[PDB]
Each structure stands twice: as C-alpha cells, then as structure tokens.
Amino acid sequence: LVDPLTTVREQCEQLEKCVKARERLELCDERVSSRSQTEEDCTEELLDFLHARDHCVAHKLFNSL
Amino acid sequence: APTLTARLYSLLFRRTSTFALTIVVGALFFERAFDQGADAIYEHINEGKLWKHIKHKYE
Amino acid sequence: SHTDIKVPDFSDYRRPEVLDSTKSSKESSEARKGFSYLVTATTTVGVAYAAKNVVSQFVSSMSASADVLAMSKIEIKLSDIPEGKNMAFKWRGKPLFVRHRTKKEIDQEAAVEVSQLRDPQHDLERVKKPEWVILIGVCTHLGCVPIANAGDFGGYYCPCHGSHYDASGRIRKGPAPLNLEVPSYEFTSDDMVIVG
Amino acid sequence: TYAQALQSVPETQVSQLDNGLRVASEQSSQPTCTVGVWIDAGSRYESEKNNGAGYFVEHLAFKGTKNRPGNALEKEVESMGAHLNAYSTREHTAYYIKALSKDLPKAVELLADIVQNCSLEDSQIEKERDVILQELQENDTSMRDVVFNYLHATAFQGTPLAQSVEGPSENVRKLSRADLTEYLSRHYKAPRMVLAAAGGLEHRQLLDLAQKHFSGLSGTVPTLSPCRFTGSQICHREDGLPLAHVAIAVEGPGWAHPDNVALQVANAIIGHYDCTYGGGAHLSSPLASIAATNKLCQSFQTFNICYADTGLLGAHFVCDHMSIDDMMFVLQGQWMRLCTSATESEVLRGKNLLRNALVSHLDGTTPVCEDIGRSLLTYGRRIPLAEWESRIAEVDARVVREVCSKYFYDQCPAVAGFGPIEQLPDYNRIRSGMFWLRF
Amino acid sequence: AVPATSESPVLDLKRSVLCRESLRGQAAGRPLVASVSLNVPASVRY
Amino acid sequence: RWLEGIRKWYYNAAGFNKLGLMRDDTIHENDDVKEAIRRLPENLYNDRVFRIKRALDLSMRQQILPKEQWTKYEEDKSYLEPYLKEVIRERKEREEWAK
Amino acid sequence: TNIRKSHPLMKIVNNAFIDLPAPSNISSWWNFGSLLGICLILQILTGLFLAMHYTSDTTTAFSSVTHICRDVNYGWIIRYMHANGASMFFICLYMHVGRGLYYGSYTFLETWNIGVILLLTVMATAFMGYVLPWGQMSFWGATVITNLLSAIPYIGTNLVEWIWGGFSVDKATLTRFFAFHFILPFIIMAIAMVHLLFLHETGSNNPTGISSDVDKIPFHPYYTIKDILGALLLILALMLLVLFAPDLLGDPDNYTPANPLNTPPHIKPEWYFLFAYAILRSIPNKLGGVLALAFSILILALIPLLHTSKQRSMMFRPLSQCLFWALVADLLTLTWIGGQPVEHPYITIGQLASVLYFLLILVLMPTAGTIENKLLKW
Amino acid sequence: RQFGHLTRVRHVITYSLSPFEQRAFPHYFSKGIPNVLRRTRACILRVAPPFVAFYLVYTWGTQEFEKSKRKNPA
Amino acid sequence: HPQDLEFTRLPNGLVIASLENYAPASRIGLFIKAGSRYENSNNLGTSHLLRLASSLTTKGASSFKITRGIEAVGGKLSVTSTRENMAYTVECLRDDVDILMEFLLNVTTAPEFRRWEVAALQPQLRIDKAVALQNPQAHVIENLHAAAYRNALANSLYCPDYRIGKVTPVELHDYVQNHFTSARMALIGLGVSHPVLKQVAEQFLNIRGGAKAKYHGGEIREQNGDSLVHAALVAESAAIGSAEANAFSVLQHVLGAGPHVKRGSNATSSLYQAVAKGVHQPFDVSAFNASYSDSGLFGFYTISQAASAGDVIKAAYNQVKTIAQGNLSNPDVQAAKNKLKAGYLMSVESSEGFLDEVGSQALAAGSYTPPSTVLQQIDAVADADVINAAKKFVSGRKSMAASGNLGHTPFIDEL
Amino acid sequence: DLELHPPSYPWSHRGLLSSLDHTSIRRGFQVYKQVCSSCHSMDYVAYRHLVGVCYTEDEAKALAEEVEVQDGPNEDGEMFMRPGKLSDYFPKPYPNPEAARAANNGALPPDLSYIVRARHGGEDYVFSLLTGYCEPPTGVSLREGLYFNPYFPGQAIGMAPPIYNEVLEFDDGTPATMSQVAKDVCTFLRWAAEPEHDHRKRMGLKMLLMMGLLLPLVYAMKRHKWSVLKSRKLAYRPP
C-alpha cells in the first residue's frame, strides 16, 4: 500500500522552483553542519521549499481520494 | 381577441378583491413549485453526497 | 398669448402602443395596465413566500428544542419486569412505575365497584393491554413517591398524609382527589414499550 | 300629466336640397323667430399652418358682402329690428339671426349673403388682425379660459383637438387673404351645412327660401382622424394670482354614444356649486354640502364635453391656495362612490334634474334653433323630448355604477392647473385616487 | 337645475378689456335687477 | 492678473455652470443671504428661482446641459453682491451700537 | 376632510412618512437613514429571540450560545443574522456620516449633535454585545479596553473596579453587561425619534447644498418605493454574509471559551473599532492615547465649527472632494494598521496615518475651503 | 411646513406623462452607458488617487514585514 | 286646444293670471310690492337680507326639507328684487307643481326667521354684495339713483356696509307682515289650470293689508384710478303707465340702446356715431331709460379713456341737443320704432320673460295688455313727442354719477 | 518565528452550493472514535447528532450502548455507571483539564468540537498539520517530548504524529492511507463545528434565486413610479 501523498510529494519535488529551493536548503545544510559555534539554524530554507512543494501537492492530491 | 395582459386585468386585477384572492392562490402554487424545483437543483449539484442519496445502503 | 404654448413631443418616452397619434389609446389601455399590475402582483407573491419562511421559522424557535425532544420519550424493555414486580424509572424529572400484573390482579381489579371509588374509572380503559399498567410515581394530593407492594388495597401506599392505591392505581382510602396519572404511550414490538 | 305633455310637443321638419344642404324647422304661432346656418368646421379641421382661420373669418363675416359692401349689411339688420350673432367651437362654426316672423324671407337672404359673398376686404383684414391680437391679451386674464385651453392641449396632445380655436399669435399676425378664401372653399360645403329655423314660420316656405339663396353652395374630402387621449398634467405655476384654477378629466365616449345619457345623470348627482348658492350644508350633493360647510372651494362644475370620436368627462374647481388637495380628495371620492355604490333614490334625483335641465333649456326660439342646427350635425337628426325621457327612465342604480366604472374606475386622467398651485396633488397621488382597495 | 353663464368667486382678479369690439354692450340702458337662488349663481342685470 | 489663469480653470472644475447656475445661486443661505434674497426685484428673483429649479431637476436625472448652454465664466453676473454687501454693512452697525 | 390629517395618531405618521415635502433630487446616500432604522428593528427582534435561550452566568454562557446554534430551531440563522446584523449596522452608520460630511448636512446642528450621541450609544451597545458569548477575544478585549480608564489620575483605578464589580472581568461584569446591552437599544430607539423630530424643523439637505423649496416631491409614493428597494438590497448584503460567509468579519479565537491564563496571540476589537484602536496605539503615553481615542470620535462635534466654505456641499468644490476622499482612504488605512501586530513598519505607518486623520480635519480641509472661496472672489 | 407654504414661484410651466402611458426603461443601455462613462470620467481622479496610494502603502508595508522577519546574511 | 291667458282679481285685491299651455315644465311666480324703495333710513338693507333668506326654516317646512324636497324633484327656487317689487319664482315638471307650491307659500306667508339662523346668514350679505360690485355698472347706477332722489328710489338693492351684521329677526318679520299682503300681491302661472290656482290663492294667500319719490338732482363721484371712466348723466323723465313714457322709449332707440351685430360699429346709433367722429380709441355709449310708478330717469351712459371722459360726455350731450332742436327724420323714428317693437316681442318670446311681463303689468297696472295693443301704442308716438322728450332732458335738472380716474371727468356745472 | 500558512485543498464542500460528503463524514467519525477519543474531548456532539447525517437511529443507538457513562443518584444515594443511549454526549477522556495535562506532560489537548472554526485555515490547516509532520532541519532541537511541525505556530508542537498508513480499518473498506485518514477526519471536524453547513447552502440557493426575481421586479416598479418626474419638461415664460 503506497500513499498517493508520498508519490505526489515526489512528482512535484522535480519542478524548477522546488529543485532550486532544494539547493538553497542544501547550501545552509553544509554551511552550519560544516562550521562550529554560531547559533544560526535553517528553518527559513525548509519552509521556503515546503511552501513551493505543498502548493503543487494540494492542486492534484485530492484526485486519488 | 384582446392580449394576454388584457384578459389578466379584466378577469383578475380590476376589482381589488379578485386582485388579492389571486395573489394568495398564486402564492400557494408558487411556494410548492419553487421549493420542489430549487430542491431538485440543490440535490443534483450535490448528487450522491447527501444522506438522502446514501440512505438505502443501511436499510 | 397662452395659445402660443404647445405641449412638447414625448415620443422617446411613450410606450410603443400609444405612439400612433391618429388612433385611440383605449384599445391598449386594458393591456398596458395588465403588464404594470402583473409586476406588482408577482412581486407580492414572491414577498409572501419570503415572509412566510421568516415568520414560520421565528415561531418554530419558541417550540421545543432537539435536546428537550431527546428526553421527551423513554424506551422500556418488557422482558426486564417479571409478573407481579413493579420497576421504577426517571421520566421528565419524575419517577415512572411500570408493573407486570398477574391473572389474579387482572380479575381482582376487573370486578371492583366503580361507584364506591372517589374517581370512578373501570380498569379496561385505564390501560391498553390487560397485563401491563404504566403510571407516573407522583402522589396526586401534595406530591410524594408511593412505595410498591404495600398498603391496605395491595398496590401502592403513601407515608406522607395517608393514601391507599389499589393494583390498577385508583385511590381507594385516603385524602388524594384524583387517581395516579396515566401517561400517553403505545406498545411498539411485542417486547418493547415507548412512553411519551 | 308630464308623460302625455311630451307626446304633444311640436315635431321638427327635415328636407334636403340638390347640393345636399339640410333644411330643419320647428313651427309654433310666434310673432318672432330665429334662423341660422350651422357648419361642421372649427379648429379640429384646421392644420398647424392655418390654425385660427375659422376664428379670423367669424370677425370679417359681418363686415360687408359683394351685394352689401361695408356697413350696408350692418345697417339693414339694425333698421328692421333684427339681431345678428355668430360663434365658433373646435368642431362647429355658426351664424344666426333673430328677426320678426314676417321678415324671415329677408332674414334667410342676409344669412346667405354673409356665408357665400363675404367681401374679405384688404384694409378690413389688417384692421381685424390687431383686434384678434388684443382679444388674445384679454383671454390671457381669464384663468377659466386659460386652464380649459390647457386641458385640451395636454389631453389631446399632438393632435388637432389640442389646438385652440383662436390660434397662436404668430398665425393671426401672418394669415393672408389667400389662406382665408382657401379655408372657406374647402370646409363651407352644402353637405357639411344645415339651415335651421324656429318660431312662427311654415317649413314649406323655409325650404323654398333656401332654394332661392343657398342653391349656389358647392357639394380630397376633409375626413376627421380620431384623436389620441394622453394621461398627462400641465402645471402653470403663478403665485401672483390670488385663487387657483384646476381642470381634471378622463376620456369620454363622444357625440353618438348612448352612455352619454347615464353619464349626464351622474354629473347631475355631483352637480355644481358656488359661494352664492342658497342651500349650503343642506344641499343634496355631498361634494356641494362639504365644500360649503368647510369653505374648500369658491365654485365647481362637472361637465362631460363631447367631440366626434372622443370627449372630456370630469370637473373644474376654483379655490384657496391651501384647499386644492382637499377639494381633489372629496371629488375623486364622489367618482369612486358612484362607480362602486350608487343608491336608487340618489339616481332618481339625478334623473329628475336632467329631465328638468333640458326641458327648460329649450325655452325661446334661439336655444330651440341651435338644438336643430347642431343635432343634425352631431347625431344626424333632432332627438325628440319623448325619446330623451325613454333613455333617462331606462337608467337605474345598476346602470350609473356600470357606466361610471367604465370611464372613471382605474383610468389615467388629464390634469390642468393654473395660479397658486403648490398644493395641487402629484399626478401619482391623483392617479392612485382613481381606485379603491375594497371593491 | 342648469348652472349660470358665469361662476362667481370672491377675491379673484377680474377679466381685462383692451379693444372697442369687446367693450361695446356693457353700457347700462334699463334699471338694475338682482337675483339669488338655490341652484343658479347670484347675478345683477341692466 | 496672474492668478486669473487658475480662477478660470477652477470655475470649470467646480462645474456648477454645467447645470446652468451662476456662483451667487450656490451661496449657502445664512440669515444675511435670506434677507438679501428677500430684497431682490421681481425679475432677478424669478430668474434665480428657475435657474435652481433647472439645476435640481438635472441633479435628479444625474445629467448636465449641452456645452453651448453652460454659464460662461465672463457672463457670470455677481447679481447678489450689492444687496448682501448692504445687509451685512447694516448688521455690523447695529452690533457696533449695542456696545 | 380625510382621516389621515385628522386622527391624532395618523396625523404624526401622515406628516412624517407620507405628505412630508422631500427634495426632488436626494441621492442613494439619503437611503442610509431608513436602513439604520431597519438594522435597529432587526437587532431588537433577533436579539429578543436569543435572550429567550441565553444565560449570563460565566459557567453556562458560552455553552448557551452554542446550544442556540446546535439545538434551538433555526437558532443558528437568528444568531449569525444578529452578528452580521451588527456589521451591516456599522457599514450603514459610517456611510450615513460620510454623506453628512461631504454634503455639509451637519449645518443642521441639533439633528447632527443627536447623531453623534446615537453613534456613541450604538458603539457602547455593540462593545458589550461582543462580550456576551464569553469567548477569548470577548474577555481579553473587554479587559484591555475597560482597563484604559485606569490611566485617569486620582480616580481611574477605582472607576475600572466599580464598572467590573470586582478585581477582574468576571461573573458580576458579564451579568450587568447583559442588562446594559438589553436596555440601551430601547434608549437609542427614543433618541433616534428626537433626531427626526429636529430634522423636520428644516426637512432634508440635497446633493447641491442649495435650498430645494422650489422643487419638493411628496415622500409617498416616490421615496417609499425607493426605501423598499434599499431595504431589499440591505437584506441581500446581510443574507449573502449569513448564508455564504457568516464568520468572514469575525475572529476564530471567539470559538474557544474564555481563559484568564492562556492569552490569544494578537488581541484586537471588532473591525468597526480598529480605526480608533490604531490611533490609541499611535501615542506611546497611555493616558495621552485614551484622550486621542476619545477625541477621534468627539471631533465629530467640532466639524460644524471648522466649516469655512461659502458653498455648503462639496459638489462644486474639487480641492475639498480630494482631501475628503483622502480622509476616507486614510481611515481604510487606520483599520488595516489596527488589525496588525505592533512592529516595523506598522508602528510608523499607524503614527503617520493618525497624524494625517487629525491634520486633514483641523487644518487642511478648513484651509481648502478658504482657498476655494478666494478663487471664486468671495 | 405644509405643501402650499414652502416658497414663492412665478411663471414656470411643467408638462408630464402618466406612468401607464410611458416606458420604465427608455433607451436604458443606448443612453445609459454613455451617461455612466461621463459620470465616472468626471469624478475618477478625485476618488481613485487616494485608494491607489492606500494599495501601494499596503503592499509595500506587507512584504516589508515578511522580509524583516527573514534572517540577515551576517 | 288654442289657449289664451285667463285673469282674476279677488275682492281682497290679489291678482291671479294663468295660461294653461300643456307644456312639460310649470313656472309659478308670486309678485309683491316689497322693493328696496319701501325701506326707511332705520331698516336699510332689510330687503337685501330678505332676498337671501328664502330656505331659512318656515312653520310648514324645515330649512333642510325646503332644500332636499326641491332638489329631489329636480326643481329650483329664485327670489328677484327691483327697486319697486319682489318676485319669488319656482320651476319644476308639471307633476310636482303642488310640491313646489307648498314650499312657495311656506317661504312667503310663514317664515320663522329664527335668531340663530338669521345671525348665521349675516355674512352672506357681504359675499353677495362683493360679487355684485365687481361690475362697475352696479357702482354707477346705485350711485346715480342715490344722487337723483331724496327718498324711496334713492334706496340701493344691496345692504349698506354699516348694516351688515345688524339686520335683526324683528326687522325681517316687520318687513314681511307690512308688505307681503293680498292688496300688494299678484300670483302668476304657466302650465297649471286657473281654477285650482284661484282656490289656493283664496285659502293660503288671503292675508290682511299693511310717500312718493322726491327727485333732487345731485352728483356722486367714485375716484378709484381705473384707466377707463364709467359715467351716467340723466334728467327726470316720465312714469310708467303714462303715454309720455312711450316717447322716451322711442327717443332711447333713436339715440342708440345697445348693439345688434356682433363686433360691429353701430351704423344706425345716433350717439355712438356722434362720439366716434371725435375720438377713435376704445369706448362705448348708450341711452339710459329707467321708468318707475312715481317717476323715471332718462339720459345716456359713457365708458371712455380717463383723459377723454371730458370729450365723450360732451359729444353725447350735443347729440341729444340737436334731437331736441328738431334734427329728426321719419326714417330715423321708423327704424327706432322697429327696434323697440322687435325688442318687446323678443323679451316675451321665452316662457321666463312672459311670466315677468304678466306679473310686472299685474302690479303696476290693473290687468294684462296684449302684445298687439302695445305695438299700436308705440306707433301712436308722433315725431313731435320724441323732440319734446329730448327738449325735457336738455332743460331738466340733471343727476350724474362717475367711477374711474375722474381727473378729466367734468362736474354737472361744467357741461 | 517565521510562519508557513496552509495551501487551499480542493474540498468536495469548497464551492458556494457544495454540500458535505456524508460518506466521508461517516469515515471521519471513526477516525475520532478509534484515534482521537482517548486524548481529545468533543463535548458538544451527542450520539443522537449522528442520526440522519452519517448513521441511522438503530446504528447510533449501538455506538452509544458501546461506551460507559455515570448517572444517578439512585434511592440509596450512590452514583452508578450505565451503558449509553442517544441522549448522552461523546464522553471526555479525563475527569478534568488538570488530569489531562499530567497524561500528555503539561500540554492540554484542546476540545475538538469547534477546532475547525477556532483555527485560521480550518480543515486546510488541520490536514496540513496531520500530514505535514517531518524531521527537523539542521541547527534545531526541542525538549524531549515536543515534536517538529512546520505548520504549527513557533514550529514546535507537543503532539505525537497521530495518524500513519492503516491506523484503522474503515467500515466501507477504503484503503486507509495517511492522507485519506486526514481528509476524512477533517471532513467530520467541519460538520462537528458547523452542522448547519448543508441547510445554510440550500437556503443560499433559494435566496439568490428569489432575490434574482424580486430585485429587477421592485426596480421596475420604482422606475414606473418615478417615470412621471424623469420625463417631465420645464418652461420659463416671464411677461
């Protein structure tokens, strides 16, 4: 039993502004997780990516329900 | 033959009495028709979504 | 001179039916009135539908709410009351006495004197089935909850003032004016009764 | 009795010449008489370019002839004791002479000389021009004349019945002697004309005199279009004048229609009043008694005016600037009450009034002469008194209701108001006043 | 029954005369009469 | 002289002229203007009364007059000035005397 | 001799409602008077029906309101009619006042001033109405707003506690708010009738701001038939909200019961107070801000005294027209800034918007009137 | 004040037509559309300018708030 | 059934004259010697209120029943006053004569003149008078008579202003009881049998009985700033019943007694042509002839422009002077006689004017003179009798009365 | 303290005249009954409320008999326990809030009656919360018991992800994926807070229609009356 959700979250993840935002996320991933002692985190970058991603998912997730 | 609107006036609308009895009798027929009609239009827009449509499945 | 005045042309504003300045307006009069008065008559029939809804709703409001109709009726299972035994219940904030009656109790409350009673009733018109009697559990004089399987006349007895009720619920010896109150009910299935 | 008295009234005699001129005569042993020519001509038969011509001609008519130039025609009538008179309505022009019975031959001669051989002198036109122009100024001061002209104008707007008889000032100032002669030769024709007479005269004699003088009368043809009635208001606001004139009417049936008899009976119930009437409160008409006790109006009369294929049925009133609303209210009320609920006794009264009205009007040889003259033009015959009674006797409370309901009940009237008329009801409020919310 | 030739008001501006054709007839020639009624408006004659 | 340019512009902006009104027709009726109006000669008063009756009827229909029929800036007589000037001059004399 | 002008009762209805001389030309901005009427009747009816079912005890209060919407027959439509009825009231009011200010109807001083009182009374009513549900915003609004009175020197602190009937907004507050909220509409009812009594001393202004005695029409049937059309459109606007978006103009937090520990994120009054709530927060000093919040409404009483123009209406006044339409846009901005959290840039926008509101009324719009006058040689 | 007491008017005629004789919507689109455009053009750049400014101070202020709650690269 | 008038004089004095003509409508008229002349200086304007007072309560019928009763059968009740007589007239259909007759008798023999009803009626004196005085001919002729006489005929037909509100119930009773008597009354009829009229007059009109006019010569002048000037100048003529009176009536029609052709010039009017020679602007002039029992006035009446009043009056006076000197041909007197003869016959043409002439003659004379005998008496007038009437007028003491802007209107002693 | 607001999912009751999917309600109930109703109360929904919506009377009577509830006192004065009936409400997990807090470590689980209406975004929001539970980003970490949800305000919530694939077996045999379980429960929570949803919209249709008729009809009467004044012509005729 595959969840239509985790299928479409993939489909939408391979769009231009998604993969562009998935790269912006990976930049600060190996900026903070490489550096030592600054209290700066990466919540902002994840939320940017999810916004773009989940906008798409909403558009066609309800087809399969 | 005089026009439809003309026959309407002479027969129903001239005496203020017949005018009133008309509106009341008309309102009875309008209520029933309007309700029945509008209820069809709602239940078609919402086909299979209402308890009225899925009642049969548990009886 | 006042003879130099001439009425302006109103053609732009006239109804088609009165443009012809050489023909009588009286033919079209019947019709033109018909049309304008049909608009009023329709409008009224519309608003008559509207106000009947608004009013009829507001009236409905004052009538019993769903949560009060919920408590209106109480279901009782007739296989959970054995022959002789009373069984008490809460109904509309009151006790409610349902009693299985024996072939003995039916015959003994059938041949009683009707006239001797303070409130003359026979038994076959105080219940719908012979073997079942449903009553409110409130004493009619000044309000007490009578005790089952006691008293002089073997049914219900009140230790408040000094009332004695028979098996049918009728006051025999005491101050109570009216007999115990017979609620509205009917039997549904053979096994179940609904009171309310 | 009264019933019998009608049966023995002198009959009216009827004969027709080659050219088509009708001769009509009522005879009674009288030392005096009245004879005249009635003509189907006036303002309704006039176009916009020639309006007022009929009225211009009436002025010239007694100002000389071919046979009797200048003041010859005038002198000859003055010296033999005669009286020479004329009038013009929107539909009828009339010239008639009151004379000694023995002088009837010369009478019928002089009428013929006026009609046919009318000088229409060039100097005499330019004179009578400035005369009509000053009458227009006098007529302007008569609130009654003004408001009624205004009623016609809006009531029959965009037709020839909306035209005044006098014509506009522009037309009186420009009409040439070409237009006047053209007008005459078109409209003044034997089949349009009736010679009527009453007094001490033999019908046979009149018919021969007609031959001798009116034989030259001529026999493309002027046909009256029907006239469109409009539910309208004309309001000439003049807070300068002390009292307000108001004229209101619905479309009436016209000359021929039998309904007119029943309508007269109803106009008789509501009737008429002014501040010099002996009755006051105790008067029979509820409009009259209420007007009187409350001092609503200075005066009022119901009319029923009749043209060919139409008419004006309503009322005029004159009143204080603060009374217009209340007068309009009580009058409209009376209309409605007759339409819905007229009583037998109050219709018997109206019947009696009308029986009395037209039997006393026909008193003297002049009003009887005019009845013959115009009846022939409007009805095509004199209607005997006995017949008028049979039509009045027919009317009951049922009739007055049904006839009134036709013309009054839920129908769009014509309104004319002049003077301090701020109060004068709004047309919608007036129109709403033409039905009840019960019947 | 029949109304009078002229309806009579109080305080209403009178009708004007501007020519000798409309003025003629008015000059009085016989003594005044006065009439009042029930039906017909009050009048005064020559 | 130099503000006459703006005066002419404002006049047509304001645009009471489009309803066939002059400036003095639009003045707010205080106790002084009432009196000034009451002192007007027949002709001036009845003209004011038509002009306004003509504007209110136009306002009722949400319309204007033809441009050929609009009040010209140059042809806008100040008809109320002399009556109102005095009425005010008079009042300020009675106010002065009262003190 | 009719019985419309005779009967002592009918006479009043005939003279105020049928034969009233009315300007030919009054526009749609004159329809807001009779619409305010309809709102007042509507609130009182729906209101009385809710009071047959509601209770003012802090324990059952919230529960009774949800009982109406769930268990009372058509209780829901009645309840959301009454809440969106209060919105439609305030829309009407601000539109009715705008008409006053633009066409200079305030010159009728008595009629105007009674107005200002009616506006303050409807405000007091609605404020106390929005507490009765005893949700979060209901309770947390009522506390912050009431507790502004504490800023008054000497007495302020006592005053707040006296209103409350305790040391916080609790059982004694909610029961008395239910009493004041019931009575006041009937006191508005009476004051509204003095409002009209004074109006018929001059009758109506009209869009030209020129006298209209030369062109009056009878109220019936002209303005009766048009009042009906207006009432019809007011019902549409109300029922669109009630039947398609009954929660659009409210706040979610008033669906969770009142909790004196747990505070809602951004506490704010209902949309028709936000303009004044923003002006309050403009001034950093708390007593100052209460004098500004008070003066933002009471300045209505000062508007007649600030009238400079020799023309009464803004019809023929272009400068004033713009500045007026600026005041309307600035009020729309104070409403937005009212419903925002206190941070950059909303602190500086709110300050500038507040300065401009008071600047427009006391200086700019009076100056504009004068400049216009000297441009017309006046 | 009553009708008949409002003010003094002289020499002004009014002609008018019964509503039962005339149309309720004479040239309603024909003459209506242009009259609307005229009325709209007349008032537009008195009414519209302030609401433009509101829109610009609104969108500017909204996505200044967003930016200001993001993190600064330092 | 060819029908000519019947006549009866009862021993108590009363006259009954009635022609049964079988017409549908029936006129009846009670003529009384109760004119304005019979008022003294104490009860002025009583006859004027008495003329308005028909329809006040009587003994037989209420004020209400008189109005409703009459209107019911489509009828009418009219009162007519001259300076010498009063005439109560009733019209109806011939079936309702005895209903109107009952009302006539009640009104004339037994009115109650109730205090409250008579006080309520007072204001109607003012309304009536106001309306009547809109005619400038009412001003001048009322004034003329007041200027010309010392007593009886000098009385106005309209109540003086100082008496409006003050004509008492007693003054009404006294005026009726003294003047409405069998010896002073003549009951006339059309469309009703003579025998039944006679019987009603015997049983319901048998009521027991109850100085001469001194000519003065004066002038009264109503200055009022009209653009026109109304003016009348007369001298003492002859009394009606005398043969001389017929001379004045011919002289009137020689000089010109009002118009014959609509919108005309009056080519056979001596006066109009005499005036029109010298002045062409708006004007009108006619001979004035009033003839009473005791006396009479003959002259002319001028309507002229304010500034031309001097010219028109003198022009018109000059025209009577040449008629008096002897400038008068048979063709003039013949044309004049024809006008007068035609005038009389036309004035008894209608049933209304006939009733007036039968009643009128019945009071001033013993009985009825037929229309043939009257034409014969106009013929009897010799050209010399006309020239005498004129001569009498030129040398007679003059009375004058004016209304208008009189700045150019002469006095009597400027003429 | 940034914020990620939910996207607007195309619900079967999105549109103006769109009713609730009642079969979707019948599923959503079960997701409260099996999953939520051991932590969250729902104190304004009774077993009688389900009748004529997602269950029959006989079905609802069974669902009610299936749970305990206190009653009394009886004649002895003792508070007993009995099986439920229709008149009974949905039972509270704990006897008070103070108990509830203990059971979840300090955090009180809200009552769900009105939770759709009481939160910005409604069913959009709740769906985004339930499905949107993800692994924290680099630099982040909350107290042992407070999980990471990007849709919750302040990015940290004290609720364990409550749904996953096949968390229950549906009575109509729908494949019980995480997303399907979240879709159905949100649909029920909507009806929970706004029972009037379907009646309201039926009225909405009938109001729009009746107005569509009455507005131009009344507007025509208005123009008819005023017609007298709109058409009138003025004239100025000084001497």
Ligand SMILES: Cc1c(-c2ccc(Cc3ccc(OC(F)(F)F)cc3)cc2)[nH]c2cc(Cl)ccc2c1=O
């Ligand atoms: C009463 C009144 C109205 C008017 C006011 C309200 C309505 C609807 C209404 C009527 C009454 C009501 O209750 C109340 F009486 F107020 F308490 C509530 C609502 C209809 C008309 N409109 C006008 C408009 C002009 Cl221009 C002038 C005077 C008036 C004018 O005196």
Ligand code: FES
């Ligand atoms: S209450 Fe027990 S019988 Fe009186």
